[PDB]
């Protein structure tokens, strides 16, 4: 199993503010088996399969359960807040070599199952942060859905 993520999102329409917490990791896939887990997070705003903003967490040293609390704003104007994506991936970094995801997930235009209901629950609710828990996938499968 990869992990699961827990943030919260916010949407307020008149300012197009749409803020990001990332809260906490857990039960994350260790990606150096007989070495140590250093997680961070990237939060990705896209559309179209475009990376239009790039946003991460801090580090976290030698943990499969890593605590955040780290908030993250991005503007999106209400005539398009139902077209974007919001893309949240756990890596593992290390200092040399590209850094490995362990997983991902999107909420937004195209998603499904309990990432579509935490979209539509903070578009219903405008200005009322909502956290909820979501389970990581592998990311060929993530980014072959956020593609094109």
Same mark, same amino acid.
């Given at each position: 199993? &990869? /992990?699961?993520?827990?943030?919260?999102?916010?949407?307020?329409?008149?300012?197009? %503010?749409?803020?990001?917490?990332?809260?906490?990791? %857990?039960?994350?896939?260790?990606?150096?088996?007989? /070495?140590?887990?250093?997680?961070?997070?990237?939060?990705?705003?896209?559309?179209?399969? %475009?990376?239009?903003?790039?946003?991460?967490?801090?580090?976290?040293?030698?943990? &499969?359960?890593?605590?955040?609390?780290?908030?993250?704003?991005?503007?999106?104007?209400?005539?398009?807040?139902?077209?974007?994506?919001?893309?949240?991936?756990?890596?593992?970094?290390?200092? +040399?070599?590209?850094?490995?995801? +362990?997983? %991902?997930?999107?909420?937004?235009?195209?998603?499904?199952?309990?990432?579509?209901?935490?979209?539509?629950?903070?578009?219903?609710?405008?200005?009322?942060?909502?956290?909820?828990?979501?389970?990581?996938?592998?990311?060929?499968?993530?980014?072959?859905?956020?593609?094109?």
């Amino acid at each position: 199993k &990869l /992990g699961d993520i827990c943030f919260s999102l916010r949407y307020v329409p008149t300012a197009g %503010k749409l803020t990001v917490v990332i809260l906490e990791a %857990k039960n994350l896939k260790k990606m150096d088996v007989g /070495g140590l887990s250093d997680p961070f997070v990237k939060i990705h705003l896209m559309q179209n399969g %475009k990376r239009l903003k790039k946003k991460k967490t801090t580090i976290k040293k030698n943990t &499969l359960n890593p605590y955040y609390n780290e908030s993250f704003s991005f503007e999106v104007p209400f005539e398009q807040i139902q077209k974007v994506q919001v893309v949240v991936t756990v890596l593992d970094y290390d200092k +040399i070599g590209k850094n490995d995801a +362990i997983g %991902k997930v999107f909420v937004g235009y195209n998603s499904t199952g309990a990432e579509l209901r935490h979209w539509s629950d903070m578009l219903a609710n405008p200005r009322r942060p909502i956290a909820q828990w979501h389970t990581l996938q592998v990311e060929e499968e993530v980014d072959a859905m956020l593609a094109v």
